[PDB]
Amino acid sequence: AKYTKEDIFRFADEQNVKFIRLQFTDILGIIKNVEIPVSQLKKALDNKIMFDGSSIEGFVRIEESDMYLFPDLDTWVVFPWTAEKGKVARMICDIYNPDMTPFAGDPRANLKRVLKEMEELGFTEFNLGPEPEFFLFKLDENRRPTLELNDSGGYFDLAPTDLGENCRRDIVLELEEMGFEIEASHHEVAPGQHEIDFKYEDAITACDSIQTFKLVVKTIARKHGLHATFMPKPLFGVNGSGMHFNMSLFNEKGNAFFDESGELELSQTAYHFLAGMLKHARGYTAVTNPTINSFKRLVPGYEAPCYIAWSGKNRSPLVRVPSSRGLSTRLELRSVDPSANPYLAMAVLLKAGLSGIKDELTPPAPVDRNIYGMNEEEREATGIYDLPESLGHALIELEKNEIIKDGLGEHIFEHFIEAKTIECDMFRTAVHPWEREQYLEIY
């Protein structure tokens, strides 16, 4: 109980907020909210706010249903970019049915249910540290994004320098002032691409931090006359954007992935988690990469994980184990992209990993032979397998796998497949300028 009702009332009185955003996330990952005056703060705290519940279902909404908007007190945050005409505050809200039951279609409720399963299994918390990457594009005269980048930087380069602008520095400063924990920020290898690293907190707080980070980055980029994009592959021939998850499992004693007497300073729980992640990776590749553009990033190379393997020496595997040990022991999954929904992503990941522990699966031997060059026979000889190359194959894998369905729940599962198949069918029937430019003259 970080905050209480009286604390929220006192904060609203003493920083004098007049606008409150009760925000939530739908299946597609779009940040949605209802906006109320500060005079209705009491009604929000009393959990009596109605809203059109079909909104969270996305564009496939059919039947309107009124449902509650139970908020969370620990997520009270006041934005500074509010001028003098009243402050603005946001609160992450749970979705509840009118019968005082959490909605099955709410990703946050699904993540809470999966975390409850973890806790009743024997663990305490599921820490996550994400490393999102975003692109910045110069706006046009009509406040429209262009295809030109703000600077021609490089990997870890000091590209934006100083003396005003430097949107990454301003974003980091605003996030720090607002009350977020930032480890480090740098320039990614692609021009105009930046990465900001976060500390390690709980899974739900990790989702809240990710969503708030997306909102803040978009707002600050817009205010500086730029456009912030989290699409994985904005341009061809340019490196994509990733959101690598550094995740660790904790118990009553402490870190469950650390053991000084084990191989690689890893506990058997860590190996079971690795086996669970590797076995079902093809299953949840769709959840971790929900957009068509996402699979354009997953191409064979030296930085895009398109194989199913784990390593700790050669790096660039599907799952990488950082050299740090002790309380910082963790397993990194590099196939996640910023367009993914964090709630569903760690829901399916936790389920897969925990199933690997329940089944006590033995992970395959790590590969440190730089798996990009070996022949197809060599890859087939080892347990190396490729991730799905398109959204449709990933959707088929989802429809085949059953554990990921349980981790996602029912309602979320059917809604996700429905919306994704519509997006896939829309992409399939479209005619692109590539086909015209390479067949109009030839044929």
Added chain:
Amino acid sequence: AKYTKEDIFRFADEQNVKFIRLQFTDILGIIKNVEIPVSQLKKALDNKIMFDGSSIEGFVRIEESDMYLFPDLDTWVVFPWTAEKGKVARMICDIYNPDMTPFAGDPRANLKRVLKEMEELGFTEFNLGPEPEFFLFKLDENRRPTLELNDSGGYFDLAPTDLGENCRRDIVLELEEMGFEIEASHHEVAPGQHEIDFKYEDAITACDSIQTFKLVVKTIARKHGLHATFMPKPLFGVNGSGMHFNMSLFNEKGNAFFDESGELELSQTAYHFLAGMLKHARGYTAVTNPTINSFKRLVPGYEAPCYIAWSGKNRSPLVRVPSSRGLSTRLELRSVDPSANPYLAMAVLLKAGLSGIKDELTPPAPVDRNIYGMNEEEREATGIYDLPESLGHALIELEKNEIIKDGLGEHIFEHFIEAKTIECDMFRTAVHPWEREQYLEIY
């Protein structure tokens, strides 16, 4: 023997040709030629012309190999649009290895081999009548195609009218003057789309007529300041272009598909051919639709065949049997598009149909229930199956089927597979403006 060497020499002397195009077709269907003066007509007739044989292999050429260019006398044609500075003539040429053997990679030689198999099986000829459809686009200031059509016509509409222009009428008149047999021409349902129907001749002559028709249509359009396109789906939301094949099998007695005492006035040979076509349709869908844009035309509707069924009453099936009987009895395949290679198309079709006759397969019962609306269970209850929805699945079906491989030969099979896989990989890794407009601002 329609023509002899002396006849060719006399023609060259009396219409005074000075430019000769020894033209041939590669695997991809692109019309290629070598151009020689009339003084070298003797060397061409002596079958002593060398050329870089790796050209017919396409862009996947690796090793240069010199090989002969044995021409065909029956295809001597003189173009009229040659002004006064000498006429131009073309001759379809077979590809021969330096050891006096036909090249395995020549589509025409493969078709000749398949026809030899047919003849030794007991049949005489394989008549074909194609119905190609093409689009006309207005050129820009820099002689570049635009996205605007020449007229907003309709199905069978009298759109181009008269008083000059009317590129379809001029094309038909030039083709008739040149010595081709034209049944009828009309305006297709899409704006700016025209269809010209041909008579029924032998398969090799059908290929020659199709290639000459493509060349003539392109040339006349260019002269009239327009661009002729055979790409199946130039625009989204606009009907595609088809090249329906009306094919019949002949024997010593006459038409092998006609029998007054049989059901539907059809012989058992016709039913065996139908069964062979239906069984392997998924196999040769790739050959009949060799481009990525081709499968954008094969979408569920009322005019695009995306199902595997035959009918003669409801129309719009995969294979339609026209009501005409007697010597005009024929089976129409509607899945072919103008971008396909006619040689490979009828090679695989003849093989499939003849295999159905050899195996005496019984075709499934025809469906006249307008197969667009019945539920998926209803379609599954009947032997209705869908054609491959993408080029990759069609390539997989080709790699699985063995009869189509025999019909294509070895060299053609591997070269086609390599080229199509390269093209599919290029399409897969590209980033299209659709993705940007759908995820850039959203994510």
